[PDB]
Amino acid sequence: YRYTGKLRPHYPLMPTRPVPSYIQRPDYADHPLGMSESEQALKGTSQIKLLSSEDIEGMRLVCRLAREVLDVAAGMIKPGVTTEEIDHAVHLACIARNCYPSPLNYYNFPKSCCTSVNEVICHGIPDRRPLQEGDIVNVDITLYRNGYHGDLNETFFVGEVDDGARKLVQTTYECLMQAIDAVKPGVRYRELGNIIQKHAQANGFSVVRSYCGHGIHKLMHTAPNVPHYAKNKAVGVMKSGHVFTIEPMICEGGWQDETWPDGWTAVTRDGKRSAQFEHTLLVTDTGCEILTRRLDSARPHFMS
């Protein structure tokens, strides 16, 4: 394998971390290949669940807990901390909230969060690498509570960063929020990529094509599929009671991606930086509820 940039994996990984049995587990947790029967059973379906009031309560709670765990991770970001140390903290913070760390064993993913540095687009695996001053690092948190998943992510700066890092991360955050601002009943899911791409392209960045936002509730990934680039062909129209994420990945160079031999880590083919932000959203009768928002503080971590 020819690496696309300066990043490398830092092995060995710690043996996988157990979750106590009193924590309720998603189906794939105990499947030998980490397959989710319940997702596979809706593979190829375009139909979007209309959440009940009970379902909405469940999503509100797990998403608030997921935000709390993200905040824990944001607190740890400093030069010299390893990504594995972040993941260990995350793992304990999930268990403390009586939640299962959704990524753990999802299709045999080895860790309890995703940590994506610099040219990593998404799904980086926490490992023994200490964060370096000038890195950008995204932490993606997904929790499972009482049969509901909640999903969010933010990009952080490690110490002082360059102006290019600042612009990339600001633009990516703006892309997400412009999309969110458009969410309401009657909007086609395909429009959001037109919005994102327009803002990315205006700032000289490209938009990853291979990974999309997604429905989420009882399943971690389900309908709708939500592309982040323009002129996509996504199926569906927003209605009150839909829950889904929007999670644009924006790049300094070209949009093309490839995957490391680990089967997870997605990197820019050119080795240039990429940043991401993610929220889980509920469509209401007039607009949307950002389930993973901060309740206590006006701005994402990288501004603060």
Q: List binding-site positions for a protein.
A: 123, 221
Cβ nearer to ligand Q04, comparing 135 with 278: 278
Cβ nearer to Co ion, comparing 101 with 241: 101
Cβ nearer to ligand Q04, comparing 16 with 132: 16
Pairwise CA distance, residues 24 & 122, whole Å: 27
Joined together, the tokens standing for residue 125 give 């695996």
Give CA 167 to chain center in angstroms: 20
Residue from 49, 58, 72, 109 binding ligand Q04 (CB under 6 A) = 109
Cβ contacts of 140 within 8 Å, gap of 6 or more: 103, 113, 114, 115, 116, 122, 123, 151, 152, 153, 276, 278
Q: Which amino acid is at 296?
A: D
75-104 positions binding ligand Q04, by CB under 6 A: 102-103
Q: How far is the CB of 186 from ligand Q04 (least distance, A)?
A: 25
101-140 positions binding K ion, by CB under 5 A: 116, 120
Biggest alpha carbon distance in the chain?
50
Decide if residue 122 touches ligand Q04 (CB under 6 A): yes
Residue from 112, 142, 265, 274 binding K ion (CB under 5 A) = 274
138-167 positions binding ligand Q04, by CB under 6 A: 140, 142, 151, 153
Q: How far is the CB of 127 from Co ion (least distance, A)?
A: 18
Pairwise CA distance, residues 226 & 245, whole Å: 8
Q: Could you give the angle at the alpha carbon of 51 between the alpha carbons of 141 and 151, nearest 5°?
A: 5
Q: How far is the CB of 234 from K ion (least distance, A)?
A: 24
Cβ nearer to K ion, comparing 151 with 257: 257
Pairwise CA distance, residues 202 & 117, whole Å: 24
b/e sequence 237-274, b meaning 16+ C-beta within 10 Å? ebebbbbbbbbbbbbbbebebeebebebbbbbbbebbb
Pairing type for strands 266-268 and 257-259 reads antiparallel
Q: How far is the CB of 100 from ligand Q04 (least distance, A)?
A: 12
Cβ nearer to Co ion, comparing 143 with 200: 143
Q: Which residues bind Co ion (CB under 5 A)?
A: 140, 151, 153, 245, 278
Q: Which residues bind ligand Q04 (CB under 6 A)?
A: 102-103, 106, 109, 114, 122-123, 140, 142, 151, 153, 214, 221, 247, 278
